[PDB]
RNA sequence: GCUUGAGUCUCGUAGAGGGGGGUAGAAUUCCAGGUGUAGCGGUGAAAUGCGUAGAGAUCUGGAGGAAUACCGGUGGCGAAGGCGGCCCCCUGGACGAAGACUGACGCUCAGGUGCGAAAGCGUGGGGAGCAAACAGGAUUAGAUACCCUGGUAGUCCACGCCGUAAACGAUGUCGACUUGGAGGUUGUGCCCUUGAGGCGUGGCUUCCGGAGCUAACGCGUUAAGUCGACCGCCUGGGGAGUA
């Protein structure tokens, strides 16, 4: 459930330091990689309707992160898509 | 449940039956569940048991007695 | 899976196919195969004595190994096999000497998992075991009657029987019918139900695909004459009698069960 | 009659009748005696007065046994459920011990509808 | 009105049965916290407490076993 | 890596082999990289009420702290082992050595 | 550009939140056996029904399905429907402390999508108890009802369909302000834990009530009060929520 170690991960990597933990491309790609565990847990059992709606809140909160940054810096929104693989 | 009185007993005593319940479940659940009326009766049990201690802190009348 | 098939023409609106993609396509096991003559309810005096049989596909018999006398050498299951003359998948393991068998396919098992029988194998399915050697309870199949009769019991895709007690000498089990039997603890038995459970939910669709399967037309006795059937007759769809078998004997309710030798072993007949 | 040391009293008080059954230790009965056999049928079977009698006819034919203590099972809500062990005491018996017996289900089977 | 670790502070525990059974009457039933005066937090604590020790057999479910 | 909590009764008649079955299972944890913290064995005690059979059995605490494809499978020796009756296991806690 | 909006991380807290898999006890039913005898059961009363083929009662052993007494509390969680024995795994949501970061990324939303009590439907199982339909016995002038004895579907499971409730605090969602008291539940700060504590600060929630509002009942800091944004809905009753 994306633990501390993953998170610790995403912050270095694609925010500017260990303290930049809450820009878009860091809280984008935190949703994704959350997104993509819980894909394996929603591949089995069919009928997790209530953590399903948790699983479509972060969805839609991606897309409302995704396209504030397309609307603010494309270069910087285009270079995240390419990274994290999304975006059809 | 079980009550012994050991020697000087001559006489029931059996008050630790009702203790518990000893009639309280069973005529319960001998019949009418309702899936509903175990939520109705317990919603109005409460709400006229704090009406009854409503009043136990409202009753400072003179009342003439 | 189960697949609903388009109703592009008659006969094939009707029609559920149970395709297993798993399935080895290719040619089976050459050694493990030999032919299988079509008798057609034929027998040594040429009669036929079990009616509603002939034609159908040609089909091969495949060797399988219902003994699972390889105690102590663990098998690696090469791939699964489609069996034309049985009902359920038969699984092709390749032993850890080069010894390539056929067994009856388990409910769970691929391509790559690794059994053993005898003894000293452990609680997982497709391992066979004896019966004082299996927890009580467990589901199992592929069940013997006799210490090394080869397992009768549980031998059809999707079905089994549960351990219900283990006293002595004798285990009691609860067969598929719904019959408690008991039976000698020296048998083997394989741990697990049978794979192809969704063999029941195959509807054949049209006429040939039954005719295909060596199955014949049924005739029903009212169509028949009085010379040929104990019903026959009928002036307008007459009946007017109690329903019996082509030879006398009465049908819908009436316990054949005569044998005398095998009924201290049965404990409850079937509901 | 074997002339059996101690014994078991059990009571079934149901809502209509009482059934009083000794039996011994091993639960096997030795006699019984309902308000219903005593006499008192309809309303009258399911009051503590015909439990109470129901204890006096249970009183003999034992037991022959010769029973000089025993236990008393308590087993449903019953019109008597006091009576009848009450006349069990007078009747020449030992009251050793009383426990309830009462098949309390931990909301188990689901009860009918019944009585409307 | 008694009180329990909610000023003696400790985790409730389903070994030590000692404390347990001040907790359970002479049926085996648990004992509400109207009657002890335990403090929410705890009294679900200790059900869970009861219900395990009931099933290590260190606590029985009643006395008609 | 979680804690756990293993506590589990064994058959009375075994109860000559209760110290057998304590190298066979923490050895099974220790050679996964899991560490023991207690051995508690609490004897052979009065049980509340008959287990399937008569009652007096054995008590062990283990109180471990192992990963999870052990602990399953620590779980399934205890299915099909009929002098195991009953066992359990528990949360993490951060498993303690005390409360005997 | 900036931070009081919104959001992310760090450390913790509570909860029947959801899904999957096992397991425990009581109880009901059924089967076999032992003891044991004329009633058992039911009702206002009675009978249908069960019983001398030996019932009811009691004990022992076994097989099954369903639900979790006590805890249990206008207690808690979830958007709603709804969710409670215990344990393993996966996982959602909420709240608190003091920091760090992005920098208005917000609110609502026709259409659309998803979830959605119970009953019912399709396929395959299961079926203890309960129980539509149905039968018999009662009541009644009549009783195809209320009562009793039975009893099928269903109630249970796996996958789909149905999208309907008095789906209701009959009160849409988000945001700001406006006397108070008495409690419950869950964090946290300070002081002496100096003694079942004292003084504050947050989330949820129950009751009574000031101003205000309302046709009144009543709501009343979780407003039906004072203001803003958006969506949906109503234009007398029947016809009819029908064709």
Redesign the pocket.
Known sequence: ??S?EA?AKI?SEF?RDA??????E??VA?LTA?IN??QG?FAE???????????L??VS?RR??LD?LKR?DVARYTQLIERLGLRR | IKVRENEPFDVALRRFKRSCEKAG?LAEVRRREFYEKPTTE??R???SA?KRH?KKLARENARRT | AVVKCKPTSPGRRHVVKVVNPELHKGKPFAPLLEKNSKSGGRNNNGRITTRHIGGGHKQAYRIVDFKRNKDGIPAVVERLEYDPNRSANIALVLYKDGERRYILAPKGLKAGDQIQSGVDAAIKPGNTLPMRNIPV?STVHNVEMKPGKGGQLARSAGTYV?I??RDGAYVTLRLRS?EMRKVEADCRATLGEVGNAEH??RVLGKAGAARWRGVRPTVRGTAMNPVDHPHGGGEGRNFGKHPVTPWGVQTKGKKTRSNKRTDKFIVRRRS | RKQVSDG?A?I?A????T?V?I??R???????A????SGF???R??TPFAAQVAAERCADAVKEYGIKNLEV?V?GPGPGRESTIRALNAAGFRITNITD?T?????????????? | ?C?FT??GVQEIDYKDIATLKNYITE????????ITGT???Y??????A???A??LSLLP??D?? | M?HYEIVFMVHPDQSEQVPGMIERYTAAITGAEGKIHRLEDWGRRQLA?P??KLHKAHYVLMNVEAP?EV??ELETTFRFNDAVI?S????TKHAVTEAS
């Open positions: 459930s994306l501390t998170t912050v925010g303290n930049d933990t809450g820009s878009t860091v809280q935190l959350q565990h819980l847990h059992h069919k009928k997790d309707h209530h953590s399903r709606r948790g699983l809140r972060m909160q409302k992160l504030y603010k | 479940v317990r919603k049990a409460k709400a704090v409503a | 309870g549960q219900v007690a719904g029941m939910l | 078991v059990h079934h149901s809502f209509n009748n059934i059954t039996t011994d091993q639960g096997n009965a030795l006699g019984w309902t308000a219903g056999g049928r309809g309303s079977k399911s099972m087993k017996v098949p309390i289900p931990h909301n188990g089977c689901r009860p009918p509808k019944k009585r409307r | 009105f009180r909610a000023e049926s085996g039933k648990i004992v509400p916290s109207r403090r929410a937090k009294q679900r604590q200790l059900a869970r009861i219900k395990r009931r099933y479910y009643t008609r076993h | 979680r009420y287990i399937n999870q602990i399953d009953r359990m296991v528990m949360r």
